[PDB]
Structures are given as C-alpha cells and as structure tokens.
Symmetry: C2
C-alpha cells in the first residue's frame, strides 16, 4: 500500500569526478502501477562536469511494475519503508569509473534517493569528460539475482551510450542492494527489469538540468 | 499558431503484411513546444500480426520541437493545415519490407494521420513474423534534406530493434514528404531530428495495444 498511487520523489546527489565537485537536486513522481517515473534534475553547483546521460542510472527501482504473478519477487518494495542501500561500480569502457552509494527510503510520504558518487581515472579527451555523448538513451534489461548471504540482491547490466560520431560507449554496471531495516525481506528468483528511458529539456529552464521519463516492468518469470 | 498548445491527434492505419490484414486506431496529444507526443493505439481487428515496435515509425513529425534559430527549416508545420503526404519504404534487413503512404493534415482542430501499409517477403520464422522483438525502443537521428524538385523533403534513417536473443534487427527507412496544398512551403537545409521513444502498456486495457511516448527535437544547424 505504499506504492498504491502516485508517490512524490526527491533525489539528491553529491559527486566528485576527477577532482571536480558538483551537486544535483531532483524532484518528481513515481507510479509503480504503470511502472512510470517522471523526474526533473538541476545541477545546483553550476554546469555539470560530465554528460547528463551518464548519471541516469545513478539518479529508484522500487517504482518498477511487477506483474501480479511476480509479486513475491519484488525485493525493492518489500524492503520499504525502512529502505535499502544501493551500491554500484560503473565501469566506462576504456575510460574511468563511478563508484556510488545511495540510501533509498521513505521520509514521511516522500520516497528519497540520497547519493554520493566518486569518479576517477577519466580521460580528459574521452567521451565522458570530452562530452561526446548524445543527449538520449537506449533500452536495456536490468538483471537481478538474490544474494542470500546479504539478505539482498545483486544486479548487473550494461548500458550503451550513443556517441556523437555514431559509435557507442559501453558502461558496465555492478549493483548491490541490501536492506536498511533488520527484518525479513523478499529474495527473488532470477528475473530482469525491462527499462526504457527518454530525456528532454524544459525549454523555460535556465539552469543545467535533465527531464527524465522512465518506464520499467519486471519480466523473466513465467 | 496551429501548434501553439496541446493538439489532439487521431491516427488510422489499414495494413496487409504477407496476406494478413489488420487495422489500428490511435488517439493522443502532441505539444510541439516541448516536442512531446503521447499516443495510444489499439489493433481493432484482433491481434496484431507483426510486433508493435515495427509500426512505431509508421504510426507525425510536425510535433518536433524546432529551436527558434531553426524555425525557417520546419517543413512539417509550414505545410499545415493542408497537410502533407508521407511515403516510406522500410527495409527489414534479411527480411521483408513495408511500403506505406500517409496523409497527415488537420481535420477541424485535430491533426489526423491516415495510413495504408503493405508488407511483403517476410520470413515466416524471422524476427518480425516470428515475434522475436523486445517491446522497447532505442534512440535514433532522423536525417532531413530538401527535395526542391518536389517542393518537399527526403528523409533517411536506420532503426535498430532489439531482438530477444540480444542481437539487433536493422530497419532501413527511406522517406519522402510532399505537400498536399499548392502554395509555397519551407525547404530546409540539411538537419536531423533527435528522436526518442518509450513503449508501455495500459494495465487495464484488454485489447492489443501500445502506449507510445515520444520526444523529438531538431538539431544540426548552428
């Protein structure tokens, strides 16, 4: 019943990529019934030092639509409201890597995603710091498996970012989610989330920002 | 001033792929100010014989957001309200092809897209008739150039459809748009539309349908 209607979402990120510090604030709404998300982010420290598309996966999988027959595999919602911790190591092929740690939980009636990100070893002339990424996103499947020892799940997937010249920059994701609370949680059978994302800009917004629409549905179990 | 706010959209398609006839009805709204589209389609003849993603490009580029400095290259809107004719030959790599003809124009206050589609040479066991396509969409650039002789434009692009096994089915698009009215129109310099699309399902809808969200912005001119 926490995810029954539209839920307000607040996101906050503090990062450092190669010595450059920035912060991002975001606000939106989620509807797990449709598996839809609408979020708007603003770089609150000026201009974002890395391309916006690279932060999409870091900037709330509890909003996925789990079909009724897959209800018992919803680790994300089952960990609420105490929330869970999401950690990732994102490896950019032939470039650097982001290490992130986030706590996602309810604070009042709002679902909050608080993140700290550290990126290192990025090439000054690569696609990321060189800003050679198109402002768009492709569709990917997010694989999930239970990590029983940790009372959580382990997730893995690969994102393909389109580069301006027509090629593609791969970003390998290694994710780990563990609950914040001390009680039992729902450990899933292997399945994946079919995720799709669309980026745009609010034509009236003067600040550096990204408008994100995302649809996510679980699949893989019959 | 036709595209000043949210405009209602009505789409209608009659098709035949390899001898199988079907019809699709769709309704939605467009906002050229944001370059956003929300459409909902229903197969009115039962189950769609081909995968929904293959019909996305066929099922209204006048809704693209043209930045102010690119205003004079908007062939699409400049052809309204008399509308224009859009014709395509879509070649599915190692498979068959769709040939489509559509008239897009205003009928009252609604923007109508009426299409006839014919597909042939499809392989019974290929990705299309075999339905091996994931229900999702990637981001692509739609290239545009003027066809002065025809008082229209010529468009070309390639769509990459994700196949369930992890590979990709390419679909080559060759497009031609000519005005329906007899007056002057705006012929653009070469530019492209950055197009992004997201597909979902209305969990309450019993009929075979596709919910489509699409964002389009013109770029390529400085």
């Amino acid at each position: 019943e926490l995810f029954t209607g539209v839920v307000p979402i607040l996101v906050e990120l503090d990062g450092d990529v190669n010595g450059h510090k920035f912060s991002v604030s975001g606000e939106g709404e989620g509807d797990a019934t449709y598996g839809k998300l609408t979020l708007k982010f603003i770089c609150t420290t000026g201009k974002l030092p890395v391309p916006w598309p690279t932060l999409v996966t870091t900037l709330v999988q509890c909003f996925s639509r789990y079909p009724d027959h897959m209800k018992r595999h919803d680790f994300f919602k089952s960990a609420m409201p105490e929330g869970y911790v999401q950690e990732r190591t994102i490896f950019f092929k032939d470039d650097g890597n982001y290490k992130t740690r986030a706590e996602v939980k309810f604070e009042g009636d709002t679902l909050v995603n608080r993140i700290e990100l550290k990126g290192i070893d990025f090439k000054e002339d690569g696609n990321i710091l060189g800003h050679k990424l198109e402002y768009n996103y492709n569709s990917h499947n997010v694989y999930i498996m239970a990590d029983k020892q940790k009372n959580g799940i382990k997730v893995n997937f690969k994102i393909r970012h389109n580069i301006e010249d027509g090629s593609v920059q791969l970003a390998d994701h290694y994710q780990q989610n563990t609950p914040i609370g001390d009680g039992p949680v729902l450990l899933p059978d292997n399945h994946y989330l079919s995720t799709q994302s669309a980026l745009s800009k609010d034509p009236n917004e003067k600040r550096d920002h990204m408008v994100l629409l995302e649809f996510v549905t679980a699949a893989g179990i019959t």
